[PDB]
Motif scaffolding. Structure first.
Motif, PDB file in Angstrom:
ATOM      1  N   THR A 268       2.866   1.746  11.286  1.00  0.00           N
ATOM      2  CA  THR A 268       2.658   3.189  11.337  1.00  0.00           C
ATOM      3  C   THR A 268       1.190   3.580  11.453  1.00  0.00           C
ATOM      4  OG1 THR A 268       2.467   3.515   8.960  1.00  0.00           O
ATOM      5  CG2 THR A 268       4.715   3.574   9.911  1.00  0.00           C
ATOM      6  N   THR A 269       0.303   2.592  11.536  1.00  0.00           N
ATOM      7  CA  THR A 269      -1.099   2.845  11.850  1.00  0.00           C
ATOM      8  C   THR A 269      -1.471   1.996  13.045  1.00  0.00           C
ATOM      9  OG1 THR A 269      -2.158   1.031  10.608  1.00  0.00           O
ATOM     10  CG2 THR A 269      -1.587   3.016   9.381  1.00  0.00           C
TER      11      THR A 269
ATOM     12  N   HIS B  19       0.860  -1.166   0.000  1.00  0.00           N
ATOM     13  CA  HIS B  19       0.000   0.000   0.000  1.00  0.00           C
ATOM     14  C   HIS B  19       0.905   1.228   0.000  1.00  0.00           C
ATOM     15  CE1 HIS B  19       1.054  -0.707   4.208  1.00  0.00           C
ATOM     16  NE2 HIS B  19       1.086   0.615   4.268  1.00  0.00           N
TER      17      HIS B  19
ATOM     18  N   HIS C 182       1.238   5.606   1.298  1.00  0.00           N
ATOM     19  CA  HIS C 182       0.804   6.787   2.041  1.00  0.00           C
ATOM     20  C   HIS C 182       1.171   7.978   1.176  1.00  0.00           C
ATOM     21  CE1 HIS C 182       0.515   4.317   5.755  1.00  0.00           C
ATOM     22  NE2 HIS C 182       1.468   3.647   5.133  1.00  0.00           N
TER      23      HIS C 182
HETATM   24  C1  LIG Z   1      -2.357  -5.504  11.886  1.00  0.00           C
HETATM   25  C2  LIG Z   1      -3.243  -4.852  10.845  1.00  0.00           C
HETATM   26  C3  LIG Z   1      -2.593  -3.613  10.273  1.00  0.00           C
HETATM   27  O1  LIG Z   1      -1.542  -4.029   9.426  1.00  0.00           O
HETATM   28  C4  LIG Z   1      -0.583  -3.100   9.040  1.00  0.00           C
HETATM   29  C5  LIG Z   1       0.430  -3.544   8.286  1.00  0.00           C
HETATM   30  C6  LIG Z   1       1.495  -2.584   7.860  1.00  0.00           C
HETATM   31  C7  LIG Z   1       1.399  -1.294   8.230  1.00  0.00           C
HETATM   32  S1  LIG Z   1       2.656  -0.161   7.775  1.00  0.00           S
HETATM   33  N1  LIG Z   1       1.985   1.246   7.370  1.00  0.00           N
HETATM   34  O2  LIG Z   1       3.464   0.013   8.971  1.00  0.00           O
HETATM   35  O3  LIG Z   1       3.322  -0.770   6.671  1.00  0.00           O
HETATM   36  C8  LIG Z   1       0.262  -0.803   9.065  1.00  0.00           C
HETATM   37  C9  LIG Z   1      -0.693  -1.661   9.448  1.00  0.00           C
END
Ligand SMILES: C=CCOc1ccc(S(N)(=O)=O)cc1
Ligand SMILES: C=CCOc1ccc(S(N)(=O)=O)cc1
Ligand SMILES: [Zn+2]
Length: 257
Positions: A195-196, A91, A93
């Motif tokens: 990061t979420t 994904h 941001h």
């Molecule tokens: C555990 C469910 C949420 O999964 C994720 C998985 C990856 C991220 S991130 N932005 O750190 O790549 C954030 C949330």
């Protein structure tokens, strides 16, 4: 429900996810002069030749391109990693403006967007178990700057019309994530977190030094997505990034001199 608005954004997250103020939170600013070359770091091994993408989903926070992770089809190994990490999804941001959007920063520089290729450590059996472990995930982060188009991104851009709103998904097979990488695999690495929310401290971050370039038209299409569900008030999916968090007791290592 947490989000990126004035009333539910990163400054509020700690009230439901106290680990938000933890000891290894992400993202961070990468101070390039303070990062230390670690000659013991191995080259990254990105093995995506057999990747099987399945679907693309607007989850109300970003869009995920999901992969079949029931076999070692697309894996990340080497670098700082011990063992084998399977690609589950990627994904991005991104910002409302080209001057912001990345989560990591480099000497305080914000990029227009940041790609996260999310992998889980196969020794934990599945993603849900992996996120409960300090070495459960490896996220490969790649910066996006606006310039020339990224041809390998266009198939993603063109399907976004079909997943405009939260909860929409579309079939998305045969997408090759190798087309999203830069030429160089030089990287920085440090221990961090999702990061979420739930902000779990389960991630080995591997952030590539070389950004990819995407066109203004490509990023403009990201910005047409919606945070909201269909039939709800329209709120553009932009600025879905968490700002840099305190480095605390961590060292960022560089794979390159
Ligand atoms: C555990 C469910 C949420 O999964 C994720 C998985 C990856 C991220 S991130 N932005 O750190 O790549 C954030 C949330
Ligand atoms: C769908 C885009 C594919 O992108 C690439 C880009 C480069 C290669 S490689 N390492 O074989 O030269 C393979 C696939
Ligand atoms: Zn992410």
């Amino acid at each position: 429900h947490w989000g990126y608005g004035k009333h539910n954004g990163p400054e509020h997250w700690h009230k439901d996810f106290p680990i938000a103020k933890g000891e290894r939170q992400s993202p961070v600013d990468i101070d390039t002069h303070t990062a230390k070359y670690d000659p013991s770091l191995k080259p990254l091994s990105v093995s995506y030749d057999q990747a099987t993408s399945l679907r693309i989903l607007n989850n109300g926070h970003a869009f995920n391109v999901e992969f079949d992770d029931s076999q070692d089809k697309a894996v990340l190994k080497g670098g700082p990693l011990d063992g084998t990490y399977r690609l589950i999804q990627f994904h991005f941001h991104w910002g409302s403006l080209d001057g912001q959007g990345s989560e990591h920063t480099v000497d305080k520089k914000k990029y227009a967007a940041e790609l996260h290729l999310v992998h889980w450590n196969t020794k934990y059996g599945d993603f849900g178990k992996a996120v409960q472990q300090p070495d459960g995930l490896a996220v490969l982060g790649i910066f996006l700057k606006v310039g020339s188009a990224k041809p390998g991104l266009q198939k993603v851009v063109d399907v976004l019309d079909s997943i405009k709103t939260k909860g929409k998904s579309a079939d998305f097979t045969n997408f090759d994530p190798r087309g999203l990488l830069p030429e160089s695999l030089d990287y920085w690495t440090y221990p961090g977190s999702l990061t979420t929310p739930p902000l779990l401290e389960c991630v080995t971050w591997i952030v590539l030094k070389e950004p990819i370039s995407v066109s203004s038209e490509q990023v403009l299409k990201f910005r047409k997505l919606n945070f909201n569900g269909e039939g709800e008030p329209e709120e553009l999916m932009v600025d879905n990034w968490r700002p840099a968090q305190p480095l605390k007791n961590r060292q960022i290592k560089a794979s390159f001199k």
